[PDB]
Amino acid sequence: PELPEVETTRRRLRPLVLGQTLRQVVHRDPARYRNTALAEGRRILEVDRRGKFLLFALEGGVELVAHLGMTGGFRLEPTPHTRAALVLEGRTLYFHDPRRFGRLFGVRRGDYREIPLLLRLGPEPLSEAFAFPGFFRGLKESARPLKALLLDQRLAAGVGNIYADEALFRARLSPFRPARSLTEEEARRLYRALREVLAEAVELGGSTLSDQSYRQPDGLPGGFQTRHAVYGREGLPCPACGRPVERRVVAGRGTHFCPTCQGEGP
């Protein structure tokens, strides 16, 4: 679940939760679900998103921050691996998290000292805060692989494997070359590709694949998967040159790409 999936969740949850009192946050894991008691007995005023985090604005200056990791998603009905429940006046949201990567943080509005990942997040890719000047600066400030850097979310929040892979293919750039090795012309292509890929994905309700671990609360599948050029298409023809898409796993991280179009491969 990346920015497009989480943004879709935010948009779909608003109609179902705005105005409702969050009666209780039921769970049995104070290590992963921190200070949730702070959020109880408060009316939900809004649902915001920062990166991949979901932030429920609660009456009285409090926020319930949700980290939807890599499985953790909210459902309208309980599941065998539901680890927490947000009990509202009219309905209940169940936190489906098979691999316990999810997190919840009851905090005073804006106080993210205990949420390091949220604290260092770069600007919102689809906002005016994500400007090319700063983007270019950040790239030249790093010698690490271009892909890896994008995943750190310091240059752009919410970017994961799917969209980094699709943006790199769109911009025709190797995911493995040094970030600072990019020319202004190239960096500009990636800047645009990243923004266009993310925007399109949001418009199509995100991507929905096989395992489909992550599901939207209404169960409506996304449609950006129909635009995937490389992600999840290993062995299939590159949509540009027909060459079989390659999937290389480096440092435990899998990356889809076309060796020909992205200047890599054997």
By CB atoms closer than 10 A (0-12, 13-18, 19+), residue 144 is: exposed
Closest CA to 262 of 189, 195, 191, 180: 189
Binding-residue pattern over the window 40 to 79 for its own copies, x denoting contact by CB under 8 A? xxx----------------xxxx-----------------
Q: How many residues interact with Zn ion (rule CB under 5 A)?
A: 7
Residue among 200, 169, 232, 170 at smallest CA distance from 7: 200
**19 forms part of the interface with its own copies (CB under 8 A):** no
Distance from C-alpha of 52 to C-alpha of 164, rounded to nearest angstrom: 14
Q: Is residue 89 within the footprint of its own copies (CB under 8 A)?
A: no
108 binds, among its own copies, Zn ion, none (CB under 5 to 8 A by kind): its own copies
CB of 87 to its own copies, least distance (A): 12
> Binding to Zn ion by residue 173, rule CB under 5 A?
no
Length of the chain: 266
Q: Which is nearer to Zn ion, 169 or 191 (CB)?
A: 169
Residue closer to its own copies, measured from CB, 43 or 247:
43
Which of Zn ion, its own copies, none is residue 260 near (CB under 5 to 8 Å by kind)?
Zn ion
Contact 238, 244 (CB under 8 A): yes
What token pair was written down for 107?
């905090």
CA 12, distance to chain mean position in Å, is 16
Q: Is 34 annotated as a binding residue?
A: no
Among 17, 38, 115, 204, binds its own copies (CB under 8 A): 38
Positive/negative CA dihedral, 82, 93, 28, 50: positive
Instruction: List binders of Zn ion among 195-254 (CB under 5 A).
Output: 238, 240-241, 243
Cβ–Cβ contacts within 10 Å for residue 8, how many?
25
Binding mask 102-121 for its own copies (x = CB under 8 A): ------x-------------
Which residues make up the interface to Zn ion (CB under 5 A)? 238, 240-241, 243, 258, 260-261
